[PDB]
Design an enzyme around this catalytic site. Structure first.
Site, PDB file in Angstrom:
ATOM      1  N   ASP A  36       0.758  -1.286  -0.048  1.00  0.00           N
ATOM      2  CA  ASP A  36       0.067   0.066   0.017  1.00  0.00           C
ATOM      3  C   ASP A  36       0.682   1.147  -0.029  1.00  0.00           C
ATOM      4  O   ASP A  36       1.440   1.718   1.139  1.00  0.00           O
ATOM      5  CB  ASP A  36      -0.862   0.067   1.187  1.00  0.00           C
ATOM      6  CG  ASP A  36      -1.993   1.348   0.964  1.00  0.00           C
ATOM      7  OD1 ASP A  36      -2.745   1.758   2.180  1.00  0.00           O
ATOM      8  OD2 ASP A  36      -1.930   2.040  -0.041  1.00  0.00           O
ATOM      9  N   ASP A 222      -0.732   5.170  -5.960  1.00  0.00           N
ATOM     10  CA  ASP A 222      -1.494   4.502  -4.842  1.00  0.00           C
ATOM     11  C   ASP A 222      -1.594   3.068  -5.231  1.00  0.00           C
ATOM     12  O   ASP A 222      -2.788   2.887  -5.772  1.00  0.00           O
ATOM     13  CB  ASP A 222      -2.662   5.089  -4.262  1.00  0.00           C
ATOM     14  CG  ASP A 222      -3.230   4.519  -2.902  1.00  0.00           C
ATOM     15  OD1 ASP A 222      -2.409   3.780  -2.705  1.00  0.00           O
ATOM     16  OD2 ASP A 222      -4.374   4.757  -2.790  1.00  0.00           O
TER      17      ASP A 222
HETATM   18  C1  LIG Z   1      -5.596   0.142   0.821  1.00  0.00           C
HETATM   19  C2  LIG Z   1      -7.136  -0.403   1.064  1.00  0.00           C
HETATM   20  C3  LIG Z   1      -7.117  -1.853   1.536  1.00  0.00           C
HETATM   21  C4  LIG Z   1      -7.729   0.629   2.109  1.00  0.00           C
HETATM   22  C5  LIG Z   1      -9.162   0.231   2.489  1.00  0.00           C
HETATM   23  C6  LIG Z   1      -9.545   0.571   3.587  1.00  0.00           C
HETATM   24  C7  LIG Z   1     -11.149   0.042   3.625  1.00  0.00           C
HETATM   25 CL1  LIG Z   1     -11.876  -0.130   5.099  1.00  0.00          CL
HETATM   26  C8  LIG Z   1     -11.783  -0.588   2.719  1.00  0.00           C
HETATM   27  C9  LIG Z   1     -11.392  -0.359   1.224  1.00  0.00           C
HETATM   28  C10 LIG Z   1      -9.786   0.035   1.124  1.00  0.00           C
HETATM   29  C11 LIG Z   1      -9.310  -0.082  -0.061  1.00  0.00           C
HETATM   30  N1  LIG Z   1      -9.934   0.112  -1.067  1.00  0.00           N
HETATM   31  C12 LIG Z   1      -9.437   0.018  -2.526  1.00  0.00           C
HETATM   32  C13 LIG Z   1      -9.756  -1.491  -3.010  1.00  0.00           C
HETATM   33  C14 LIG Z   1      -9.103  -2.506  -2.456  1.00  0.00           C
HETATM   34  C15 LIG Z   1      -9.658  -3.317  -1.499  1.00  0.00           C
HETATM   35  C16 LIG Z   1      -8.498  -4.231  -0.787  1.00  0.00           C
HETATM   36  C17 LIG Z   1      -7.128  -4.481  -1.477  1.00  0.00           C
HETATM   37  C18 LIG Z   1      -6.645  -3.491  -2.075  1.00  0.00           C
HETATM   38  C19 LIG Z   1      -7.563  -2.584  -2.939  1.00  0.00           C
HETATM   39  C20 LIG Z   1      -9.960   0.974  -3.212  1.00  0.00           C
HETATM   40  N2  LIG Z   1      -9.958   1.198  -4.593  1.00  0.00           N
HETATM   41  C21 LIG Z   1     -10.842   2.326  -4.930  1.00  0.00           C
HETATM   42  O1  LIG Z   1     -10.791   2.740  -6.302  1.00  0.00           O
HETATM   43  O2  LIG Z   1     -11.351   2.668  -4.114  1.00  0.00           O
HETATM   44  N3  LIG Z   1     -11.022   1.784  -2.838  1.00  0.00           N
HETATM   45  N4  LIG Z   1      -7.850  -0.111  -0.208  1.00  0.00           N
END
Ligand SMILES: CC1(C)Cc2cc(Cl)ccc2C(N[C@@H](Cc2ccccc2)c2nc(=O)o[nH]2)=N1
Ligand SMILES: [Zn+2]
Ligand SMILES: [Zn+2]
Ligand SMILES: [Zn+2]
Length: 393
Positions: A36, A222
């Site tokens: 990340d 990111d």
């Molecule tokens: C880094 C991380 C895990 C932080 C996170 C926290 C939470 Cl609580 C929910 C989603 C995310 C998220 N969402 C990513 C998607 C994701 C989910 C899990 C692992 C990697 C990426 C995202 N991409 C986007 O266009 O909008 N949100 N990325």
């Protein structure tokens, strides 16, 4: 652990990021850890959860030390919270070193660990300024560099539920992972990996906005975000442009919101009607930029469906932002991305794992000269909370 040892050390599922194996504690507990670049904490599941089958057990680590300090990390989308400590940490398919790092042991979380994604924790690779609870908690990569001889650099080749692979080369640049020129844009300020976009084109046509609109209120690289996320005004102009190019096909509103798949007969998707998008990034030289050019196959992402094995179906993976531009996996999967912290710059080259089109190629091209910019960076309004905090480092 030379660079041959680090090639292919990433795995994931489409839409749920990329993880690398890490070990924590003594004896080592092996976990899959999301890579990340958009955050700065190293945090691991540390208690049972329905969607985890392993987790860090501090009680089984002889080297664990409790810092007796809690941390609470909210997201728009959920949260994690936990207990800070330190332990020994190693990357089995990375450099042959062990370091004592801060670890947040996640004790409770909401909508963070998803059903079957396969990572147990998160490795925030960005800088201390955005670490929680504050910038005094040294991020993992700062500890790595300070405690070892590992060069202050890492690079990511993200290769793109379907399983995905890639590489994180810690401490160097592996020339087997890209072709062509490596072009560098400056890290504007060390918090996120913040950069400055100077021009945007959709099929060779300039969006012609005030270039500060491109970076409102920041633009960041990111690996923790899936989509390309664009500030409201930019997203609207982009959607207008892509809709124009693809106007042979009238999709529903929900498609353009990423809320609905659109399909064609298997093998017949009309790729040619969807335009390429070029983001021109500030060059290391004043008045220069270079472009990174995204194929439609990067921003329309296949989703396999039950009632449509007959069909190739896709989700639109560009979305509106209120927190600036985010070059997430949609952008990064085209490219070998160099996070050159030592030289405060990010490099882009065409990836050896290309996501290819019949007639067009994801590209990194320059230079393009202007008369810059005339400053395309946005200055975030300074809060009294920001302003008053002392940073005695
Ligand atoms: C880094 C991380 C895990 C932080 C996170 C926290 C939470 Cl609580 C929910 C989603 C995310 C998220 N969402 C990513 C998607 C994701 C989910 C899990 C692992 C990697 C990426 C995202 N991409 C986007 O266009 O909008 N949100 N990325
Ligand atoms: Zn392994
Ligand atoms: Zn003071
Ligand atoms: Zn400080």
């Amino acid at each position: 652990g030379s660079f041959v040892e680090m090639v292919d050390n990433l795995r994931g599922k489409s839409g749920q990021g990329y993880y690398v194996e890490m070990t924590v504690g003594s004896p080592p507990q092996t976990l899959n850890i999301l890579v990340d670049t958009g955050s700065s904490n190293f945090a691991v599941g540390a208690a049972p959860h329905p969607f985890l089958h392993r987790y860090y057990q501090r009680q089984l680590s002889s080297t664990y030390r409790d810092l007796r300090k809690g941390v609470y990390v909210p997201y728009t989308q959920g949260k994690w919270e936990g207990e800070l400590g330190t332990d020994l940490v190693s990357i089995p398919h990375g450099p042959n070193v062990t370091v004592r790092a801060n670890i947040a042991a996640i004790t409770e979380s909401d909508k963070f660990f998803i059903n079957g994604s396969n990572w147990e924790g998160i490795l925030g690779l960005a800088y201390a300024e955005i670490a929680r609870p504050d910038d005094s908690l040294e991020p993992f990569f700062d500890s790595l560099v300070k405690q070892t001889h590992v060069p202050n650099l890492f690079s990511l080749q993200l290769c793109g539920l379907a399983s995905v692979g890639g590489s994180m080369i810690i401490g160097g640049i592996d020339h087997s992972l890209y072709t062509g020129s490596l072009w560098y844009t400056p890290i504007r300020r060390e918090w996120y990996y913040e950069v400055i976009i100077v021009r945007v084109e959709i099929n060779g046509q300039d969006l012609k906005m005030d270039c500060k609109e491109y970076n409102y209120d920041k633009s960041i690289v990111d690996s923790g975000t899936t989509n390309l996320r664009l500030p409201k005004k930019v997203f609207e102009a982009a959607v207008k442009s892509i809709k124009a190019a693809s106007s042979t096909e009238k999709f529903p509103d929900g498609f353009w919101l990423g809320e609905q798949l659109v399909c064609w007969q298997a093998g017949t998707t009309p790729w040619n009607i969807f335009p390429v998008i070029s983001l021109y990034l500030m060059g290391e030289v004043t008045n220069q930029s270079f472009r990174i050019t995204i194929l439609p196959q990067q921003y329309l992402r296949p989703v396999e469906d039950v009632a449509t094995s007959q069909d190739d179906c896709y989700k639109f993976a560009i979305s509106q932002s209120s927190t600036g531009t985010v070059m997430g996996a949609v952008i990064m999967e085209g490219f070998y991305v160099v996070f050159d912290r030592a030289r405060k710059r990010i490099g882009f080259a065409v990836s050896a794992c290309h996501v290819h089109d019949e007639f067009r190629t994801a590209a990194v091209e320059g230079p393009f000269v202007t008369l810059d910019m005339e400053d395309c960076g946005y200055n975030i309004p300074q809060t009294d909370e920001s302003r008053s905090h002392h940073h005695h480092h």
